[PDB]
Design goal:
Chain lengths: 203, 197, 380, 407, 398, 248
C-alpha cells in the first residue's frame, strides 16, 4: 500500500485543474485563506465520508435513483455536521454559515461519489475523498494566497503588506477581491500544472 | 407588468453564470460547441423552470414554518428535500436525452448526472425560499435564471468556436483558457453592477 | 526544384493595403484627438490651478510638481495668460510618460511572447498602446498604466495567441482592469484634471446629479455648452474629450475602409433609440433620462469608443448583419449603463466588453440562417 | 418525539412521490424486455439479446464472428460494422479510426458501440463464414533465428477456403511456457545461445487471440503452412514480459494441436495485367509465398512478378529452394534478397543492405513507370514505413500499394 | 437579367484590342498534369514518341476512362516531373498533320444523338477534359451525368478576350456545340453570357442567362450559385465557349478542333490584342517579339487567377483563354456577390475546419471564386490554395 | 427492479431522516440557548463592555445594559417586558406589526414590528450609549446588526452583525472586525435629518463622515446593509426615536 491515491489528486487529477468540479465554491471563498482553509477541510471530510458510505451501498444502488441516494448521503451528513456543530462548538458553527449548501452542491462531493465510490472499495473510496479535497485545497489555497495578499495585503488576516489606508505603502488591488480574478488565477494555475505535467495538455 | 421586470433581473442583472458565478463547473466544461452548449442550456432551462416552482409549492405547503401544523416548522428538511427533487428531474432528464442522446448524453457524460448538484440549480431554489416568490413569480424567476444561464453557456460556446482560429498556448488550451475567457466574460457582465431591481 | 502549380497559381496582383498600413492609419487617426487631448489636458489643469492658488502659493505648487516646473523650464508659463504652446506642453508632460510607459511595458510582453513562442512581432500593438494611453485620466499613475497595459496585452490578447486571435478588446480590457482594481485613480473628482488639490466632477457625473445646470467648469465658473463638449474643451480622458477630433480621424479610417461603418451606424442607432426612449419615458428623479442623443454623443468616451474601439475588427462580429447588431448592442448598453446604472457615470468600455462577448453569437445566428438557405438550395 | 417522527413520514412521502415519477418515467421511457438486432437483414442471422454489453460481445455469441485485434479498447478498427439504424451517432474515438465518408455509410466499431436499443447490421459473407477447426501440428522446425514454420494438418479433411494473403486467428488459453522447451537447430541456436533467449519463460495471464497470415497457396491441400516469429521483449525494453502467443506456438512439436478459428483478411492482389512487385520481411514470407504460388499455378499468370525479401543473414533466409524453382521454372517471376548484415561465413556476393534502398537502386530507380505497378508489402514497421516513403517519393498512389504489416 | 453588385474589376493597363489576329507560330505544345484536379497520370507516351492530333498522351488513375489526348501532332520532347514524380508537363514539338478522326453527324441530328455516343466521342478525342464538375472542379467521370451544364459565354477577367468576337466567327460550330450539350445534359444547358447577343440553340433545353456586373459575374461558380446551386448531390458541369466551339467542330467534321483565340494583354504588351494560338501553346514562343524590355511575368490566365508561365509550366493552361504579361515588382464582403458569409468561410479555410467550410458553401467554390478575396486580403492570405486543401481533404475523408 | 428501488429509497430515506430530524430537533434546544447567549455577547461587544463566558455575559449584561421598548410610530419609550421581548415574532403578526409598501420597504423586510426593543448602556446611573437592532434582507439570508449610537443620537460608537447567513469571505464579511471597526466615528444623519450612512461600492474615501466601504465582491449583501439602514433610520423605523435622543 502507498499514499499514491491520497496525494495523486493534489497535482495529477486535481478536481478543479484537470477535471472541472468544485469551481463555484472556489470563486467565493478564495478571497480569504481562512475561509478557503475551512472549505478544503470540509470538502475533504464530507467527500471522504460520503464516498465511504456510497461504497458500502455501491453494489445495491439503483441507477434510476442513484443520485437521489448519493445526495441523501451527502445532504444528511452535511445537515448533521451543521446541527451537531450548532449545539456544541457554536462559535465555529457560525463559521460553517452557508457552507452547508456550498458543500452539498460542490461537484467534487457528488463527482467522486459516482466516478469512484460507485466502483470502488469503501476504504480506498475514503482515501479518495481525502485526496480530492487536498487537491481542491491546493488550488483553493494557492488562489487564496494571491487574492488575499494582493487584494488586501493580508494572509490569514495577518498584515504582510502595510496598507495606505492604514498609513502604509501598499495600495490594495480591487480586482483580486472579485470573481474574475479567481477565474484568471485558476486558469494560470492550470497553465503551470500542464506545462510541468505535459501529460494533461488537451489535443 | 411586474413580471417582465422579474424576467429581466434573472436573465441579465442576475445572470446566474456571469453575474452570480453559479454553475461554473458544467458551464466551463461543455462550452466547446454551440450546438451541444445550446442543448445543455435548453435542458438547464427545463430543469430550472420545473425545479423552482415545484420546490416553491413544497416549501410553502410543507417545509414552510407553521404550514402543515401549527408549531412545527420543517425548515431543517430544506436542503435534503430540494436537492432530492432536483436529483429526480435530472434522473428523468438523463432518460429524455436517450432520445436526443447523440448531442448531449455522450458529451455531457459524467456531467449529465451533475445537472443536479449544480450551484445554479440549488441556488435558484434558495433564492426562491430566501426571498418570497409566489408560484407565478417562481416560474418567471426559474425560467429567467435558466435563460440567462443558457445565454452565458451558449455565448461561451460561440466564443470558443471563434477560437478555432485562435492560437492558445498548450497548457492553457481547453480548461485554462476557458477560465480566462469566463473571467473576461464576467468582466463585461459587470455592466449591470449598479442596476437595482 | 520545381514547385507545383499550387505555388504558382497565387494571385499575381495584390491590393496595396496590409496589416502594417491599417494599424498606422488607425494610429494617425487618433493624432488629432491626441494632440487636442494634450492641449486640453494642459488647458484644464492651468485654469484650475489659478482658480485654487495665486501669488507665492501658486509658485510653491508649481515648484512641488515636476509637471509644472518642467513646463516652466522648457519655455511655458503656468499663469492663466498661457497660450496653446504651454498648454500642449503641460498636457504632453502627462500623456507622454503614460504613453511611453504603456508602449514599453506592453511592448515588453508583446516581444516576450513572440520571442518565447517563435512568433514574429505584430504591429497591432501600436493601436493598442496609443488607444489605451488616450482613454486614461491625465493623472493616472505610471505604475498603474504599466499594470493596465500588462493585463490588456497579456490576459486579453497574448494568452489567446496574439493579434487577430483574441475575442476581447485589449485596450478596454486593460482599462477595465484599472477601473475595477484602482477605481480611486480612474474615477471621482480628483483624477480628471491635473491640478493637484483640485476637485471637479466631469460633465457626465454632473448631469446625473442635477443636469445641464450643473454643467459648470468649476475652475472657470462658466458653463459647459454642447459646443464645449463637442470640441473637447471639457475635463475627461485625454483623447476622448474632442468629439470633433475623433470624427475627423474616424472619418478617414472609415473612408479608407479600415473601420466598419455598419458598427458605427449600429452604435448610433442603439444610442439614439434608447436615449430617445428614456427621453420620452421621462423621470422625475433620474436626471440622465432627459439627456438627448446629441448630448450622449459629445460626453464621456462614447465618441472615442464608437469610432476607434467599437470598430476593433477582431473583437467585433465578422458578418455584416452581425455588425449592425453588434453596434446596436453597444449603443444600447452604453446608454443603459449611463442612465440606469448609478455606479458608473459612463458605460462605453463596459458596453463594448459586453458586446464583445456576444458578437460571436450574432455571427453564429446569421451563419446558421445562411446554412439553412443553402441546404434548401436558396429556393432555386 | 414530535416532528422527529413527523418529518420522517413527510420526507418519505416527498421521496416516494419523486421516485414514483422517476419509475413512471422509466416505464414509459426506458425499454423493457430484450433487444433484437438484425444481422444482414436475414431473420436467421438476427440475434435477440437482452439490453447491456457491447456489440462485439453479442455478435461473437451468434453465428457471425467479427474480426477484432485490439478487443474492447476501440484501437485497431478492424471490427467496423454497418449500423443501418440504431446505435446513435459515431463516438469521437471511433472517428479516429473511421472517416466521415465511411460514417455516412454507417461504419461503426462494435466494441466501442454499446448495445442499448434495437440496431440493424449488414455483415458480409466473409465475416459470416468463419469456421473453427483445430489442426494438428506436423512440423515446428525453425526456418531462421527467430522465425518458425508451422505446418497444420486439417482435421476435417480437404483444405481451408481462403484467399491468397489471408490469415487465420489463433486462440490460446492462459498457459505458462518456457523458452527452454523450444527445440531449435544448431544453425539457429547461435544468437539464441549468445543472448540466451532460452531463459525467458512466458506466463500468459489471460486467454489471448492473435492473427497469423497464411503461407500456403489455395491449391495446396493437406498441410496449412504458416510462419511464426518469436516474440521476445523489445530491443529497447528488456524489462518486458516475453512472447505469449508466438512462444506458445514455438513450444509445440509434432502431434500438437491448435485452433485456427476460420479465415480472415483483406490483403489480396488485383485481377489485372499490371506488373506485380512484392516486398517481404521476416514473417512476411508467409503471405508473399502464397501470392507467388497463387500467381504461378493457381492462376498461371504471365504478368511480370518480382519479389524482394529483406533478411539480415543467410541463416535468416528460408524457403530459398522453393523460390529458386519458381523463378527458374517461370521467367515471368524473379526473386532477390539482400542481407542487411552478411555473416563472415556467408560470403554473400549479391545484393547487400536494406530492400528499402536495394529495390530502388536496382529496379525502381530506372523503372520507366514505377507508378504503373501493384506493390504488396509485409515486414517490420521500419521496413514498411521506409519502403512506403520511398514508394510515395516515386509517385505511387496508396491505391497501388497494399500493406499487411505484422509488426 | 441577373445583375451583380458586389465585386471588383481590376483596371490594369494594357487591355486587348478585341480584334482577332494571328499570333506567333507555335512549334511547341504541352499538357499540364498539375492543372487537372486529382489527376494521377498513366503515361501512354515516352520521350521521342511521335503523336497524332487526338492521340492519347496519358490517362487518369483516379478517373478511369478519361483520356488526355495531344493537341497537336508531333514529337514528345520531354515529360517533366517534379517532387514525387508529379507530371508537370508533357511537351510535344509540333510537326506534321496526322490526326485521329471521329464520327461526323448532321447539324439537325446533334441534339438527337444518344448520350452514350456523345460521351464516347468526347472521351476518345480528349475533349471530355473540357468539362469540370463544380463541387470539386474535376473532370467528370466517364459514367457520370449532370442535369445542369453551364456554358461560360462571358469573360469578366481583367484583360480577358471578348467571347462575342470569338463566338461570332464560329456561329455554326457554337450552335452545334450547344445542341450536343443539349443532348448531353440530363436537365438543361445554361448559356451564361453578358447582355450582348449570341447565336442561339433551337433546343428548348438551352437557356440563355444574362449576368451583368463586376468581375465575379463571369465565373461559372457565380452562375451556378444563382441558377443551379451545387452540393455533394447536385453536380454541375462547366465548359467555356471556346470548348463548346471545339465540341461542335468535333461532331460536325469528326476532327478534334484545337485552335483557340486568347487575349495577349498587360502593361508590358506593346500591341495588346486577340491572337490565334493552339491548346497548350508555348507562352515563351507566344509572347516573343510582343513584350516591352525588362523582367516581365507571363501569366497563363488572368492576373487574378492564372499560372506563372515559367519553366515546365510555361504553356497555355487547358482552361485558360488569355495570357497576361506584367512587370516583376470588410474587404471580403465587398467583392463576394454570393449568398455566403465570406469572412467566416475564409477563417474556416485558414483554420482548416473542413466540415465548417462545407456548411458555409466551400463546395460551391473553385479557386478562382476566392481570387478577389485573396486580392483584397490585408493579411495577404492565398485563399485559393486553402480552398483546394480543404476540398482535397473533403474528397479524401469523404 | 421495482422491489429493490422502493426498499432502498424508503430505508435510506428513513435512516437519514431519523438522524437528521433527531439531530435537528434535539440539538435545536441547545442551539437556541447558545444563540440567545450570543446576542447578549454582541450587545456587550458593540457596547464596548468586555465579557467572557456565558455566566459572566449574563451577569455583565444585566448590570450595564437596560433594554427598553420604543414605539416606532412615535419614537417614545413605552412600558413592557423589554428584557423578554422578541421583535422578530412581533413583526410576523399584523397586531404588533404593519405591512410595508413597496415604496416604504427600503430594507426589503416584509413586515416591521410596531414596538421594538432598544438597549441602553449605562456606565453609571446615566445611559452612555444606545444600541439599536437593525435588519434587512441580504442576497443569501437576512442580516441582523447592532448599532451602538452615542447619547448624541448622531455619532455611532460601534457596529456588529449578530445573525448573518451570507457566504463567508464574500457576504460574511459583516463579521470582519476591520469592517465593523470602520463604522466607529461615522455619522448616521445629514444636516436635513436624512439617512447619510452610505455603503460605498469600491471603498469610501478615507475619513468620510458617512462613508463605509462596501463588501468586496458582495454588492448584494452590501446592498442589504444599505437597505437595512435606509429603512430603520427612516420615518417608520428609529428615526423619530433618534430625534428624541439627540435632544436628550
Ligand atoms: C493479419 C495479421 C497477421 C499476422 N501474422 C503473423 C505471422 O505470420 N507471424 C507472427 O509471428 N505474427 C503475426 N502477427 C502478429 C500476431 O498478432 C502477434 O503479434 C505475434 O504472433 C506475437 O504474439 P504475442 O501475443 O506473443 O506478442 P505480444 O506479446 O503482443 O508482443 C509484444 C512484445 O512485447 C513483449 N510483451 C509480452 N507481453 C507484454 C506485455 N504485457 N506488455 C508489453 N510487452 C509485452 C513480447 O515479447 C513482444 O516482443 C499477425 C498479426 C496480424 C494482425
Ligand atoms: C488577475 C489580476 C491581474 C494580476 C496582476 C495584479 C498584480 C497586483 C500587484 C501589483 C503590485 C502593486 O504594487 C504597487 O507598486 C507600486 C510601484 O511603486 C507602489 O507605488 C507607490 O510608489 C510609486 C512611485 O513612487 C508612487 O507613484 C505611488 O503613488 C505609490 O503607490 C504601490 O504602492 C503598490 O501598490
Ligand atoms: C441619418 C443621419 C443620422 C443623424 C442623426 C439622426 C437624428 C436622430 C434624431 C432622434 C430623434 C430626435 O431627437 C430629439 O432630440 C431632441 C433634442 O434635439 C430631444 O429634445 C428634448 O426632448 C426631451 C423630452 O422629449 C427632453 O427631456 C430633453 O431635454 C431633450 O431630449 C428630443 O426628445 C429627441 O426626440
Ligand atoms: C445580450 C443580447 C444578445 C443575446 C440575445 C441574442 C442572441 C440570441 C442567440 C441565441 C443562441 C443562438 O442560438 C442558436 O440558434 C441557431 C440557429 O440560429 C442554432 O442552430 C442550430 O440549431 C440546431 C441545434 O439546436 C442544429 O441542429 C441546426 O443544424 C442549427 O440550425 C444553434 O444551435 C443555437 O445555438
Ligand atoms: C479599426 C481598428 C480599431 C482597433 N481598435 C483597437 C482598440 O480599441 N483596442 C485595442 O487594443 N486594439 C485595437 N486595434 C488593434 C487590434 O485590431 C486589436 O488589438 C485586436 O483585438 C487584435 O488584433 C484596432 C485595430 C483596427 C484596425
Ligand atoms: N488536437 C488538436 C490540436 C492540438 C495540438 C497539439 N500540439 C486539434 O484540434
Ligand atoms: S456547479 Fe457549482 S460547484 Fe459545480
Ligand atoms: S476491437 Fe479494435 S476497434 Fe473494435
Ligand atoms: K450612470
Amino acid at each position: 500500500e502507498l499514499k499514491k491515491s491520497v496525494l495523486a489528486p493534489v497535482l495529477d487529477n486535481n478536481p478543479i485543474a484537470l477535471q472541472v468540479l468544485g469551481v463555484c465554491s472556489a470563486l467565493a471563498v478564495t478571497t480569504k485563506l481562512e475561509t478557503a482553509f475551512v472549505m478544503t477541510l470540509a470538502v475533504m471530510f464530507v467527500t471522504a465520508l460520503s464516498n465511504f458510505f456510497v461504497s458500502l451501498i455501491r453494489n445495491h444502488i439503483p441507477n434510476s435513483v442513484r443520485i437521489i441516494v448519493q445526495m441523501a448521503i451527502i445532504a444528511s451528513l452535511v445537515i448533521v455536521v451543521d446541527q451537531i456543530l450548532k449545539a456544541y462548538l457554536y462559535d465555529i458553527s457560525k463559521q460553517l454559515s452557508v457552507f452547508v449548501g456550498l458543500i452539498i452542491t460542490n461537484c467534487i462531493v457528488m463527482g467522486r461519489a459516482e466516478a469512484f465510490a460507485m466502483k470502488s472499495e469503501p476504504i480506498p473510496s475514503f482515501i479518495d475523498g481525502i485526496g480530492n479535497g487536498l487537491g481542491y485545497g491546493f488550488v483553493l489555497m494557492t488562489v487564496g494566497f494571491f487574492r488575499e495578499l494582493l487584494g488586501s495585503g493580508k494572509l490569514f488576516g495577518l498584515e504582510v503588506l502595510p496598507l495606505i489606508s492604514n498609513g502604509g505603502w501598499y495600495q490594495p488591488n480591487g480586482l483580486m477581491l472579485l470573481a474574475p480574478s479567481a477565474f484568471f488565477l485558476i486558469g494560470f494555475m492550470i497553465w503551470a500544472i500542464r506545462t510541468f505535467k505535459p501529460e494533461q495538455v488537451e489535443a | 407588468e411586474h413580471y417582465i421586470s422579474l424576467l429581466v433581473k434573472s436573465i441579465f442583472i442576475e445572470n446566474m453564470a456571469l453575474s452570480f458565478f453559479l454553475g461554473m463547473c458544467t458551464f466551463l466544461a461543455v462550452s466547446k460547441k454551440v450546438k451541444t452548449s445550446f442543448g445543455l442550456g435548453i435542458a438547464v432551462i427545463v430543469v430550472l423552470t420545473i425545479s423552482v416552482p415545484v420546490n416553491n409549492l413544497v416549501y410553502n405547503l410543507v417545509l414552510k414554518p407553521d404550514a402543515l401544523v401549527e408549531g412545527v416548522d420543517l425548515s431543517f428538511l430544506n436542503f435534503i428535500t430540494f436537492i432530492g427533487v432536483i436529483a429526480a428531474l435530472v434522473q428523468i432528464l438523463e432518460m429524455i436525452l436517450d432520445r436526443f442522446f447523440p448531442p448531449l448524453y455522450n458529451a455531457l457524460g459524467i456531467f449529465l448526472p451533475l445537472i443536479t448538484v449544480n450551484c445554479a440549480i440549488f441556488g435558484g431554489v434558495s433564492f426562491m425560499v430566501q426571498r418570497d416568490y409566489s408560484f407565478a413569480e417562481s416560474v418567471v424567476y426559474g425560467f429567467g435564471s435558466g435563460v440567462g444561464w443558457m445565454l452565458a453557456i451558449v455565448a461561451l460556446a460561440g466564443i470558443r468556436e471563434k477560437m478555432k482560429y485562435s492560437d492558445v498556448p498548450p497548457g492553457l488550451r481547453g480548461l485554462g483558457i476557458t477560465f480566462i475567457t469566463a473571467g473576461l466574460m464576467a468582466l463585461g457582465f459587470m455592466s449591470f453592477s449598479g442596476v437595482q431591481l | 526544384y520545381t514547385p507545383g502549380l499550387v505555388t504558382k497559381r497565387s494571385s499575381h496582383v495584390r491590393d496595396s493595403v496590409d496589416l502594417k498600413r491599417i494599424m498606422i492609419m488607425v494610429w494617425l487617426a487618433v493624432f488629432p484627438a491626441m494632440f487636442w487631448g494634450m492641449y486640453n489636458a494642459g488647458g484644464q489643469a492651468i485654469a484650475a490651478l489659478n482658480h485654487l492658488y495665486s501669488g507665492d502659493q501658486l509658485a510653491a505648487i508649481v515648484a512641488g510638481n515636476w509637471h509644472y516646473w518642467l513646463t516652466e523650464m522648457l519655455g511655458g508659463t503656468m499663469s492663466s495668460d498661457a497660450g496653446w504652446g504651454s498648454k500642449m506642453l503641460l498636457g504632453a508632460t502627462y500623456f507622454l510618460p503614460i504613453y511611453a510607459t504603456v508602449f514599453i511595458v506592453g511592448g515588453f510582453w508583446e516581444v516576450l511572447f513572440c520571442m518565447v513562442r517563435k512568433h514574429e512581432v505584430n504591429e497591432g500593438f501600436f493601436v493598442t498602446s496609443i488607444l489605451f494611453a488616450l482613454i486614461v485620466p491625465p493623472t493616472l499613475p505610471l505604475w498603474q498604466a504599466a499594470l493596465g497595459i500588462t493585463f490588456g496585452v497579456v490576459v486579453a490578447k497574448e494568452v489567446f495567441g496574439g493579434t487577430g486571435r483574441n475575442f476581447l478588446n485589449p485596450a478596454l480590457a486593460g482599462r477595465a482592469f484599472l477601473f475595477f482594481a484602482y477605481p480611486a485613480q480612474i474615477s471621482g473628482d480628483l483624477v480628471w484634471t491635473a491640478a493637484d488639490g483640485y476637485s471637479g466632477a466631469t460633465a457626465l457625473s454632473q448631469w446625473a446629479q442635477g443636469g445641464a445646470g450643473a454643467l459648470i467648469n468649476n475652475a472657470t465658473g462658466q458653463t459647459i455648452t454642447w459646443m464645449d463638449a463637442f470640441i473637447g474643451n471639457i475635463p475627461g480622458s485625454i483623447g476622448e474629450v474632442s468629439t470633433l477630433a475623433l470624427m475627423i480621424g474616424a472619418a478617414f479610417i472609415v473612408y479608407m475602409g479600415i473601420a466598419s461603418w455598419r458598427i458605427i451606424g449600429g452604435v448610433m442607432i442603439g444610442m439614439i433609440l434608447l436615449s430617445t426612449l428614456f427621453n420620452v419615458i421621462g423621470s422625475d428623479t433620474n436626471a440622465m433620462f432627459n439627456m438627448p442623443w446629441h448630448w450622449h454623443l459629445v460626453l464621456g468616451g462614447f465618441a472615442f469608443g464608437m469610432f476607434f474601439m467599437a470598430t476593433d475588427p477582431v473583437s467585433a462580429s465578422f458578418t455584416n448583419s452581425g455588425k449592425w447588431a453588434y453596434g446596436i448592442l453597444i449603443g444600447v448598453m452604453c446608454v443603459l449603463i449611463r442612465v440606469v446604472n448609478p455606479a458608473y457615470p459612463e458605460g462605453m468600455m463596459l458596453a463594448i466588453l459586453f458586446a464583445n462577448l456576444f458578437a460571436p453569437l450574432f455571427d453564429h445566428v446569421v451563419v446558421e440562417r445562411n446554412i439553412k438557405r443553402r441546404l434548401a438550395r436558396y429556393g432555386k | 418525539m414530535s416532528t422527529i417522527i413527523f418529518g420522517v413520514v413527510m420526507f418519505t412521502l416527498i421521496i416516494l412521490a419523486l421516485v414514483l415519477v422517476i419509475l413512471f418515467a422509466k416505464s414509459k421511457l426506458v425499454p423493457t424486455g430484450d433487444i433484437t438486432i438484425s444481422i444482414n437483414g436475414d431473420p436467421e442471422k438476427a440475434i435477440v439479446t437482452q439490453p447491456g454489453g457491447k456489440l462485439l460481445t453479442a455478435l461473437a455469441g451468434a453465428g457471425v464472428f467479427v474480426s477484432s485485434a485490439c478487443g474492447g479498447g476501440g484501437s485497431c478498427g478492424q471490427c467496423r460494422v454497418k449500423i443501418k439504424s440504431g446505435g446513435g451517432d459515431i463516438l469521437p474515438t471511433e472517428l479516429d479510426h473511421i472517416s466521415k465518408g465511411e460514417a455516412r455509410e454507417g461504419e461503426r466499431l462494435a466494441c466501442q458501440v454499446a448495445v442499448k436499443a434495437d440496431m440493424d447490421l449488414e455483415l458480409p459473407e466473409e465475416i459470416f463464414g468463419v469456421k473453427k477447426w483445430e489442426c494438428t501440428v506436423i512440423s515446428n522446425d525453425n526456418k531462421a533465428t527467430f522465425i518458425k514454420e508451422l505446418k497444420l494438418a486439417i482435421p476435417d479433411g480437404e483444405s481451408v477456403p481462403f484467399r491468397a494473403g489471408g490469415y487465420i486467428q489463433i486462440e490460446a488459453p492462459a498457459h505458462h511456457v518456457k523458452y527452454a522447451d523450444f527445440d531449435v537447430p544448431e544453425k539457429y541456436r547461435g544468437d539464441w545461445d549468445k543472448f540466451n533467449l532460452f531463459r525467458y519463460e512466458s506466463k500468459v495471464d489471460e486467454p489471448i487471440i492473435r492473427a497469423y497470415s497464411m503461407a500456403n497457396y489455395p491449391e495446396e491441400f493437406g498441410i496449412i503452412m504458416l510462419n511464426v516469429r518469436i516474440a521476445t521483449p523489445p530491443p529497447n525494453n528488456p524489462n518486458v514480459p516475453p512472447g505469449q502467443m508466438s512462444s506458445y506456438i514455438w513450444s509445440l512439436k509434432a502431434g500438437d494441436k491448435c485452433t485456427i478459428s476460420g479465415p480472415f483478411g483483406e490483403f489480396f492482389a488485383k485481377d489485372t495485367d499490371a506488373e506485380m512487385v512484392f516486398i517481404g520481411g521476416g514473417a512476411g514470407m508467409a503471405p508473399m509465398r502464397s501470392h507467388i504460388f497463387d500467381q504461378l499455378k493457381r492462376l498461371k499468370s504471365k504478368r511480370k512478378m518480382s519479389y524482394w525479401y529483406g533478411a539480415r543473414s543467410k541463416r535468416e533466409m528460408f524457403y530459398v529452394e522453393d523460390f529458386d524453382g519458381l523463378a527458374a521454372e517461370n521467367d515471368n517471376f524473379v526473386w532477390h534478397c539482400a542481407l542487411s548484415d552478411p555473416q563472415p561465413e556467408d560470403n554473400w556476393t549479391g545484393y547487400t543492405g536494406f530492400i528499402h534502398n536495394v529495390l530502388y537502386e536496382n529496379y525502381l530507380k530506372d523503372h520507366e513507370a514505377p507508378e504503373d505497378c501493384e506493390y504488396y508489402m509485409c515486414g517490420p514497421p521500419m521496413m514498411n514505413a521506409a519502403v512506403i516513403n520511398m514508394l510515395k517519393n516515386l509517385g505511387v498512389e496508396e491505391e497501388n500499394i497494399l500493406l499487411d504489416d505484422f509488426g | 437579367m441577373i445583375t451583380i453588385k458586389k465585386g471588383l474589376d481590376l483596371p490594369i493597363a494594357g487591355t486587348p484590342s478585341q480584334v482577332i489576329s494571328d499570333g506567333k507560330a507555335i512549334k511547341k505544345v504541352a499538357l499540364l498534369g498539375e492543372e487537372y484536379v486529382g489527376m494521377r497520370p498513366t503515361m501512354h507516351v515516352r520521350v521521342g514518341d511521335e503523336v497524332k492530333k487526338a492521340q492519347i498522351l496519358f490517362e487518369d488513375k483516379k478517373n478511369p476512362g478519361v483520356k488526355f489526348t495531344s493537341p497537336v501532332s508531333g514529337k514528345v520532347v520531354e515529360i517533366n516531373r517534379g517532387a514525387k514524380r508529379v507530371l508537370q508537363s508533357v511537351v510535344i514539338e509540333v510537326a506534321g498533320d496526322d490526326q485521329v478522326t471521329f464520327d461526323k453527324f448532321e447539324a439537325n441530328q446533334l441534339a438527337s444523338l444518344n448520350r452514350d455516343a456523345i460521351k464516347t466521342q468526347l472521351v476518345e478525342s480528349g475533349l471530355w477534359t473540357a468539362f469540370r464538375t463544380r463541387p470539386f472542379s474535376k473532370v467528370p467521370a466517364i459514367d457520370s451525368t449532370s442535369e445542369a451544364i453551364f456554358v461560360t459565354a462571358m469573360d469578366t477577367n481583367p484583360l480577358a478576350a471578348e467571347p462575342t468576337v470569338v463566338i461570332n466567327e464560329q456561329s455554326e460550330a457554337f450552335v452545334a456545340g450547344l445542341d450536343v450539350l443539349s443532348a448531353l445534359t440530363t436537365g438543361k444547358v445554361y448559356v451564361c453570357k453578358k447582355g450582348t447577343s449570341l447565336p442561339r440553340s433551337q433546343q428548348p433545353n438551352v437557356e440563355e442567362h444574362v449576368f451583368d456586373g463586376p468581375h465575379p459575374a463571369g465565373l461559372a461558380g457565380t452562375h451556378m450559385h444563382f441558377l443551379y446551386p451545387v452540393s455533394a448531390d447536385h453536380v454541375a458541369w462547366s465548359i467555356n465557349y471556346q470548348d463548346v466551339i471545339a465540341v461542335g467542330q468535333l461532331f460536325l467534321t469528326g476532327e478534334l478542333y484545337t485552335q483557340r483565340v486568347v487575349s495577349l494583354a498587360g502593361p508590358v504588351v506593346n500591341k495588346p490584342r486577340l491572337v490565334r494560338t493552339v491548346m497548350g501553346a508555348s507562352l515563351e514562343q507566344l509572347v516573343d517579339s510582343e513584350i516591352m524590355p525588362g523582367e516581365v511575368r507571363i501569366i497563363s490566365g488572368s492576373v487574378l487567377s492564372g499560372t506563372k508561365a515559367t519553366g515546365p509550366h510555361a504553356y497555355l493552361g487547358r482552361y485558360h483563354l488569355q495570357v497576361s504579361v506584367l512587370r516583376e515588382g470588410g474587404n471580403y464582403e465587398k467583392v463576394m456577390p454570393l449568398d455566403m458569409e465570406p469572412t467566416l468561410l475564409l477563417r474556416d479555410l485558414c483554420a482548416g475546419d473542413s466540415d465548417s467550410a462545407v456548411r458555409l458553401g466551400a463546395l460551391e467554390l473553385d479557386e478562382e471564386d476566392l481570387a478577389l478575396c485573396t486580392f483584397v486580403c490585408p493579411g495577404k492570405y492565398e485563399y485559393g490554395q486553402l480552398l483546394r486543401e480543404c476540398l482535397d481533404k473533403i474528397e479524401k475523408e469523404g | 427492479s421495482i422491489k429493490k428501488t422502493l426498499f432502498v429509497v424508503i430505508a435510506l430515506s428513513l435512516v437519514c431522516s431519523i438522524i437528521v430530524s433527531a439531530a435537528a430537533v434535539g440539538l435545536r434546544d441547545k442551539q437556541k440557548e447558545n444563540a440567545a447567549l450570543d446576542k447578549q455577547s454582541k450587545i456587550l461587544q458593540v457596547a464596548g463592555i468586555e465579557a467572557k463566558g456565558s455566566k459572566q455575559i449574563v451577569e455583565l449584561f444585566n448590570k450595564s445594559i437596560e433594554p427598553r421598548l420604543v414605539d416606532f410610530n412615535t419614537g417614545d419609550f413605552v412600558e413592557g417586558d423589554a428584557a423578554n421581548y422578541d421583535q422578530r415574532k412581533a413583526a410576523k403578526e399584523a397586531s404588533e406589526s404593519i405591512k410595508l409598501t413597496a415604496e416604504q420597504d427600503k430594507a426589503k423586510i416584509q413586515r416591521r414590528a410596531n414596538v421594538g426593543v432598544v438597549y441602553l448602556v449605562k456606565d453609571g446611573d446615566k445611559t452612555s450609549k444606545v444600541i439599536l437592532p437593525v435588519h434587512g434582507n441580504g442576497l443569501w439570508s437576512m442580516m441582523y446588526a447592532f448599532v451602538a449610537v452615542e447619547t448624541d443620537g448622531n455619532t455611532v460608537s460601534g457596529l456588529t452583525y449578530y445573525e448573518q447567513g451570507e457566504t463567508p469571505g464574500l457576504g460574511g464579511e459583516v463579521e470582519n472586525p476591520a469592517w465593523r471597526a470602520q463604522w466607529v466615528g461615522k455619522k448616521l444623519f445629514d444636516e436635513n435629518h436624512k439617512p447619510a450612512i452610505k455603503i460605498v461600492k469600491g471603498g469610501a474615501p478615507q475619513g468620510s463622515e458617512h462613508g463605509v466601504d462596501g463588501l468586496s465582491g458582495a454588492t448584494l449583501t452590501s446592498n442589504g446593509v444599505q437597505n437595512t439602514f435606509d429603512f430603520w433610520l427612516g420615518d417608520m423605523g428609529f428615526g423619530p426615536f433618534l430625534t428624541k435622543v439627540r435632544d436628550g
